[model samples]
Target: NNQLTVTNNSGVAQINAKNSGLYTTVYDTKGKTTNQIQRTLSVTKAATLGDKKFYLVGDYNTGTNYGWVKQDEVIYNTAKSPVKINQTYNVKPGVKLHTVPWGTYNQVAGTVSGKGDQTFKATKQQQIDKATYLYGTVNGKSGWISKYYLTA
Candidate 1:
């Protein structure tokens, strides 16, 4: 399991030249290269990629697209909204773990232990769809689980 650290920074900061170049392209959710802003520009959103953190900001001056700039270059003001760190819940019998958040994919990543009412530890991210599912770490592994079969 990859040890992931989630950090929230709020403010404006300029791009750094250290991690910028021809390969400094930003990607969206679907994994598409989007934009490239110079060190002269600034970013607001805060997120991390592996151990190296970055900010996701729009291309205000150039009007290209959103990109992740090095966090060391940016100075933060206020933190972003709080995110859930961890959660404890009970799993139903035959609760199937998923590789992705959606169910239609039919890719069963694994199954939660159904031996008894063994509680599971999940590190939840921001719920994009609160009514249906949540994405998080199950048993120290990351995946998506439906909220229907989970009980606090």
Candidate 2:
């Protein structure tokens, strides 16, 4: 089988799979907008390209596309944290998303880029102790956002 992704709070799901567009930016299989993957993602295989490395991961709706993501930036899905079903919610207005290289919602413990707020949707959730997180791509530069940034 492939690896993780999901859409709602149901099913104990954990997906990187986008329901309508591309989110996870895998660096290989250079064609098609790579779909977000399943609700149970993790490295299924490993290899090195000289000083570089990669992980064989899942593909949306297809299980395995035999795709690859550069392993230079660690996917800190630690806690040995498991992916969970994504529950979509509106983030606070004018909030900014911290973007960075691909990783779990917890991995990008830093921010890079965002466009304030534009139909921002979290793809997954993780809690670091009492801190909560979600991985969202408000402007296609997917990154982490705090739960406190969400609207009620």
Candidate 3:
């Protein structure tokens, strides 16, 4: 199941981009190549130009397939994660709130603690390399905390 090249700096998009429509090339934000893989892709935004449609394959996070996808190929995937945004997640006390998503840049912005337990609502989220990060706050400081740290 972990066979896909789902990391940032991947060159699949460019290979397709250089094609003369051989493999349906990847494109830039303005439909340029140099560009930018997602399976059952997570689209962040979409655009339409007259009779054409385009979808951004990933969010601003560091990952591959940041290129644009043509309209006809965009079969939507409604896959849902057990952990969701805006929900209250009880995290392990003393888990540091991250300034950015972990994996690549694991910097902590703050530490979440409530004596022995911590519960906070995730206002924002992102999925990268199969890990999920939730954004929330404690004691007026806000940032991301991993989903695995959640008790429920």
Candidate 4:
């Protein structure tokens, strides 16, 4: 347990907690000590990863436990709007190109609508034919990704 200093930042009044910490401390106005409240605590580990994993309190959402955890960029679009991903794909009829996001194994949220002349909206520069995986999310979910500007 970490010892923390409680200071009232509110200008008008002080904030009081009925119970705080393993043992609660009460304070009155003018920064004077009042009374102490006794408390009983039961601590348990919710998650453990190889004795090397640790997380901050309240940081991990234990409500819906996702088996796989990975870092991903959160992207937002206008509510129900679908995002179009342009990639440097060889869309010369009957050619299928698969693309993945840049970092972290995240889910694809969108699809590549291979329509028209297969021209990319914006050109992405590449060196030695490496695929540039541009990813964005919609509706708080990881969006689909496409590899663009394949060069080498």
Global lDDT scores for all candidate models: 0.47, 0.44, 0.49, 0.23
Model 1 alpha-carbon drift over 4 Å, by segment:
1-85, 126-130
Candidates ranked, most accurate by TM-score first: 3, 1, 2, 4
The runs of at least 3 residues in candidate 2 whose Cα sits more than 4 Å from the true structure, single-residue gaps closed, are: 1-80, 100-117
Q: Give the C-alpha miss distance for residue 38 in model 3, angstroms.
A: 24
Over the full model, what C-alpha lDDT does candidate 3 score relative to the true structure?
Answer: 0.49
Estimate TM-scores for all models. 0.38, 0.35, 0.42, 0.21
lDDT of 2 by residue, 62-124 (tens): 335344454443332322263565666766665555432223342333343344435656677
Clashing pairs in 1: 10-77
Worst 10 residues of 2 by lDDT: 6-15
User: What digit string (tens of lDDT, one per residue) describes model 1 on residues 40-130?
Assistant: 2324345555656656654432334355655554433332332564667777656777653333233356676766654666666323223
Model 2's alpha-carbon lDDT is 0.44
Candidate 4: residue 137 Cα off by (Å): 13
Best by TM-score: 3
Clashing pairs in 4: 87-148, 88-148, 88-149, 109-143, 109-144, 110-144, 128-151, 128-152, 129-151, 129-152
TM-score-superior candidate, 3 or 4: 3
